C-alpha cells in the first residue's frame, strides 16, 4: 500500500483465493499498461504461489483457467 507486484507472494497458510485477490488488487493499483499487467500476471501469478500450491498449479499444465486453478487448490 503501495506495494510492487513483484513483492506479492502467497503465504504458507494463505488460501490461494486470498493470494489471487491480493495479487489482483496490487496489480490494479500499479501504474502500468494492460500489456505490462498481462506480462506480470503470466510471469508472476503461478511462480509466486507457495511451493505446495505451485506443485498443484504446474501439474494442471499451461493454459489452465483461473476457475480450474481455484478448483485444484
Amino acid at each position, epitope marked *: 500500500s503501495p506495494t510492487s507486484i513483484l513483492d506479492i*507472494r502467497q503465504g504458507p497458510k494463505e488460501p490461494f483465493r486470498d493470494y489471487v485477490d491480493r495479487f489482483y488488487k496490487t496489480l490494479r493499483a500499479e501504474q502500468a499498461s494492460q500489456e505490462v499487467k498481462n506480462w506480470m500476471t503470466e510471469t508472476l501469478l503461478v511462480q509466486n504461489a507457495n511451493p505446495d500450491c505451485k506443485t498443484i498449479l504446474k501439474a494442471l499444465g499451461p493454459g489452465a483457467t483461473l476457475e480450474e486453478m481455484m478448483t485444484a487448490c
Partner: nanobody
Amino acid sequence: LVESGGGLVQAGGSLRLSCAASGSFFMSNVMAWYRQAPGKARELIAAIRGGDMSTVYDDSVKGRFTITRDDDKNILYLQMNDLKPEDTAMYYCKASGSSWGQGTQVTVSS
C-alpha cells in the same frame, strides 16, 4: 544496492542506468525499472524475466528504452535513447523482495 547513470541531457539525448545489486536480488526471476516524477505515482516502465530473457515495456518507452540483465556481474541496466522532456523523473530498479533503493535522477531539457 547501487543505482547510477542518471543526469542532465538535452532532448534526443541518451543515458544508461545501472542497478548493481547483491546475489539475493539477482535470484529474482523478474526485475523491473520504475519511473517516479514529482507529485505522481510510480510507473512500471520496463521488466525482464530470467531464463528466456523475455521483456515488456510501457507504451511511452517502446523503441527507445532497453532493459538488460548481466547475471555474470549482477547488474541490471536501462538503456535510454531519444530522451524526451516528459522522461524527467527518478528511476528505481526492483526485484521480488528487494528493498527500494535511492533511485537515480534523469533530467531532460527542452
